[PDB]
Amino acid sequence: AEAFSFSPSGFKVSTVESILGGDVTTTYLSSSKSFQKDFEALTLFINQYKVEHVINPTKEVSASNPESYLANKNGYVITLDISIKNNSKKDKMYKADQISLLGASKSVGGSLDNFIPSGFHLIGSSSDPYNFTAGKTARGLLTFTMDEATYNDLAKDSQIGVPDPSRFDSSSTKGSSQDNVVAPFPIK
Amino acid sequence: EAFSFSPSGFKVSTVESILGGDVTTTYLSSSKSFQKDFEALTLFINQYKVEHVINPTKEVSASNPESYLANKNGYVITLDISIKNNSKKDKMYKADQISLLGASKSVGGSLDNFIPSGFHLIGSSSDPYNFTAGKTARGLLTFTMDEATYNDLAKDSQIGVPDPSRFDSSGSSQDNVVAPFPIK
Ligand code: NA
Ligand code: NA
């Protein structure tokens, strides 16, 4: 496999190495579906994910680009291939960058941009990437970027926190009605 | 008696005043239990209580999120927290983005629900989310949930406290904290 894609072989190609250089290794790969949650209207699937260890990065990265966090230190990038299926007849909002990884004493927020090539972003609709068209399934990437200590903190019994889409639904007026999921999410 | 930050004052049930029914404090932590020094802000948890609400009897406006527990049993967890701004510049923080992280569920906080007048966490008179340089703000943060959700959290309970950097206009540099938070 030469170019990154959502296929089983394409997914193994390192966007991270293309950006940071250095010594990059895939330390964990989960190539089969590992999560499905049916909320009221949206179903979220995790199709596959990978964990990459970057040491001794060597490429130039714009200091203002959030990816630069790992341009001058070792760390890990965890890339998830996710799908959001809208089962409703109405468009629904979701903000997948609000998904987090939960470790022992640290948590890491998701990104819909870091280490994600054009063509592979999670986009609900052209009018608004956060608005998921009725009936459709959108597929794209979500990444978590961290230093080595943070990976080590998450290494055993990490979880993934997935907010209820109701947080983003203007008709929902009680925060306590949210069914926010916390699920096992091994990264080692 | 009236609510206050004293050890006995903190035990006064604002929740019962709003919901009626039968309200019982099932867990009480009366000594400082959490401190994190972020870049500019230090956040402390001074004390907290867990209250079980059974069969509320008082009317609550439907437009008030407190009404989540107007017609069901549940729990309200109230924290007394302080935020000190060690910087020479005012800093933003939205403490309602703190969450309780359970075994399989999480619950977001509120700076409004079940909090008595005079005890809100208010960073400054300009904007409650803006914390005045060199000052310490103190006030309440609550978490409201049904019984099943409490039971889930209580099995394996942590608190998630976001790095204030997320609210500072000027991501992986975030030092987001997860801390033990026993609630039974
Ligand atoms: Na944890
Ligand atoms: Na937990």
Task: Give a structural overview.
Two copies of one chain form a homodimer. Chain A has 188 residues and is mostly beta strands. Chain A has a single domain, classed as Immunoglobulin-like. Chain A has two helices and eleven strands. In chain A, the strands form three sheets. In chain A, strands 1, 2, 3, 4 and 9 form a five-stranded antiparallel β-sheet that branches. In chain A, strands 7-6-10-11 form a four-stranded antiparallel β-sheet, with helices on one face. In chain A, a hairpin with a 3-residue loop joins strand 2 and strand 3. The A-B interface holds A 66, 69-70, 75, 100, 102-109, 111, 114, 145-147, 159, 161, 167, 173-183 and B 63, 65, 67-69, 74, 99, 101-108, 110, 144-146, 158, 160, 166, 171-179. The structure holds sodium ion (2 copies).
